[PDB]
Amino acid sequence: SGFRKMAFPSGKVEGCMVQVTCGTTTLNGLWLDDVVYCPRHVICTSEDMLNPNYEDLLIRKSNHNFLVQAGNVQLRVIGHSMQNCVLKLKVDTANPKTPKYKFVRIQPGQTFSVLACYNGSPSGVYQCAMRPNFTIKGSFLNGSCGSVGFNIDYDCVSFCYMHHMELPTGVHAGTDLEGNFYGPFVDRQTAQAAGTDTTITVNVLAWLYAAVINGDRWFLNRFTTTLNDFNLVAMKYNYEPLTQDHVDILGPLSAQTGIAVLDMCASLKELLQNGMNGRTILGSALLEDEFTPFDVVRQCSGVT
């Protein structure tokens, strides 16, 4: 029992973290096989960031200008290319610590662990969710760029995120490992406002099932609702509309607890309309939306 915002064990990612320096800018890189992945803004100076022409900037850069350091050993850069907003630095040595890996572009609402790094060194790990507005509410400071988001399935690390930017609102924007930003963000020091941050309804329901499994049941009511009735409430409270796909993925939680998905929706409806009335659910005084139904199942069963 107990329910925690659990991150994946970061070991497999730690062995991939390197430091990339280009000129006077130092950020993190991800070394997998003989390639180092890093945000292309490593080639920029603070002045360049206002309106960078990355292709023009990359012309003035040679393989020797990219300093890649793994722990304390230097990697020899034998190739460089730009793929969208990431630089792929071909090095002469395959990372001996490269885990089994995939590059995945996650959907909004999906969660992942972040291994926050500075100068190629890991400082901490935390669980995040790709917000519906394609930002992540992370914890990053200057130098954290290049830190990656990932998920792990047994021995395979699915890298899904690379941190690039902090928006003026303190929220974070980044790319998948092909260098494509999540959301409409560009890697430019320009004000880019994020869209409405809606609540990930399916995740809140998944977390409500986790609460029932772990003992917190006060919020269960004598009511039920329909997907349409629930969505009227979800729209008013800036919750993502619930679909039959969401109901389907909540099926294993509904089966374990014996609480129909629409019955749980009615509990969520009442929680939205009446608040928590000073009470808590899994030690939280608000509705947690950064646990997917898969995370709840995984944590509640002990998947390693």
Annotated active-site positions, please?
41, 145
Task: Please tell me whether residue 256 adopts helix, strand or coil conformation.
Answer: helix
**By C-alpha distance, which of 14, 16, 57, 64 is closest to 36?**
16
Residue type, 210: A
| Rounded distance between C-alpha atoms, residue 31 and residue 85, angstroms | 17
* Helical residues (DSSP H) of 27-169, grouped into ranges: 54-59
Q: Which stretch binds its own copies (CB under 8 A): 34-42, 62-70, 222-230, 271-279?
A: 271-279
Token pair listed for 184:
């409409």
Cα(first)–Cα(last) distance of the chain, in Å?
A: 16
> Min. distance of Cβ 302 from ligand LRC in angstroms?
10
Given ligand LRC, its own copies, none, residue 304, with its beta carbon under 5 to 8 Å by kind, binds its own copies
Is 288 an interacting residue with respect to ligand LRC (CB under 6 A)? no
Is 271 an interacting residue with respect to ligand LRC (CB under 6 A)? no
**Out of 187, 216, 288, 290, which residue is the one contacting ligand LRC (CB under 6 A)?**
187
- Taking residues 127 to 156 in sequence order and writing x for each that binds ligand LRC by CB under 6 A, - otherwise, the string is -------------xxx-xx-----------
Cβ closest to ligand LRC, residue 73 vs residue 193: 193
Q: What are 107's strand-pairing partners? A: none
* Residue 92 Cα distances to 33, 68, 74, 155, angstroms: 10, 11, 11, 25
Cβ closest to its own copies, residue 120 vs residue 262: 120
Distance of CA 7 to the CA centre of its chain: 11
Q: Contact positions toward its own copies, by CB under 8 A?
A: 1-12, 14-15, 115-119, 121-126, 128, 137-141, 143-144, 166, 170-172, 214-215, 275-276, 278, 280, 283-286, 298-304
